[PDB]
């Protein structure tokens, strides 16, 4: 509801990484990505481009995050545990947790302190900064995906994936 709805999302996204950047027993590692992947998509679903955000659910969070959890059963199937119930996990959680607030603490909460830490201020409504409006074409972001001009791009990325199967049709 506030003007600060973007900044209040990204701190969760920063704390999403510190969830799995330390050592959480790789089934809660899935609960670090799906949290961050949605919260990160909460940022991208502003600014106009909604098609580019909704694909991050389908192809990343829908595709790779099943297979990343479709393993950790066929391998690494030891007796599971939870993070923060040990001593090596909590000792690294707090280390960036202060700086997750301390960077916020003086970037602009002082007036201007002093020369080097005041060039980039928090807020205000110039985060989007896109006025004025446009036309009835698209966002856009809408007329951007092209089987026009880029043909050398697609003819590689189509063909790079075709050898992607043939490398994995072997060793396994």
């Amino acid at each position: 509801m506030m003007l600060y709805i973007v900044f209040i999302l990204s701190v969760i996204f920063v704390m999403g990484f510190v969830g799995f950047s330390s050592k959480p027993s790789p089934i809660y590692g899935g609960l670090g990505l799906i949290v961050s992947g949605g919260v990160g998509c909460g940022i991208v679903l502003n600014f106009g481009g909604s098609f580019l955000g909704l694909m991050v659910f389908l192809i990343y969070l829908g595709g790779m995050m099943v297979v990343f959890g479709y393993t950790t059963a066929m391998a690494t199937e030891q007796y599971p545990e939870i993070w923060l119930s040990n001593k090596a996990v909590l000792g690294a959680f707090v280390t960036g947790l202060l700086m997750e607030f301390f960077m916020v603490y003086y970037v602009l909460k002082d007036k201007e302190v002093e020369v080097v830490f005041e060039f980039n201020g928090l807020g205000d409504w110039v985060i989007y900064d896109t006025g004025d409006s446009g036309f009835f074409s698209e966002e856009a972001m809408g007329i951007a995906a092209l089987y026009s001009y880029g043909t050398w791009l697609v003819i590689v990325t189509g063909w790079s994936l075709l050898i992607g199967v043939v490398v994995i049709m072997e060793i396994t």
């Binding site: 192809i59 393993t71 066929m74 199967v165 994995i168 396994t172």
Partner: protein, 112 residues
């Protein structure tokens, strides 16, 4: 500003009914045998989860067929366009580039 209050209603009604159904009669005053009988019909089962090869290749194969439908995804947006001989002949390429990746793997699948 309701999108975002269109779902936080739906999840706080979801987490409401869980704790009321589960956790509230979990504090009841019955005898509540805590003995290790709670597992059904596979009593001990003193083993680790064994690897199964034919249930790993199903994960990777899907992932490489999942990518190039997102390349294939902006085909309806590629209709109202300029030069369209390019647009047709490039759209037919990726599908065949998906089709050959079948036929090579199709000579060896296994009991999937």
């Amino acid at each position: 500003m309701n999108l975002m209050l269109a779902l936080l209603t739906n999840f706080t009604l979801a987490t409401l009914l869980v704790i009321i159904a589960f956790w509230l009669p979990q504090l009841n005053v019955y005898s509540e045998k805590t003995s290790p009988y709670e597992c059904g019909f596979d009593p001990m089962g003193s083993a680790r989860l064994p690897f199964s090869m034919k249930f790993f290749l199903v994960a990777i194969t899907f992932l490489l067929f999942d990518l190039e439908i997102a390349l294939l995804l902006p085909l309806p947006w590629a209709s109202q366009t300029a030069n369209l001989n390019t647009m047709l002949t490039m759209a037919l390429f990726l599908i065949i580039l998906l089709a050959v990746s079948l036929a090579y793997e199709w000579t060896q699948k296994g009991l999937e």
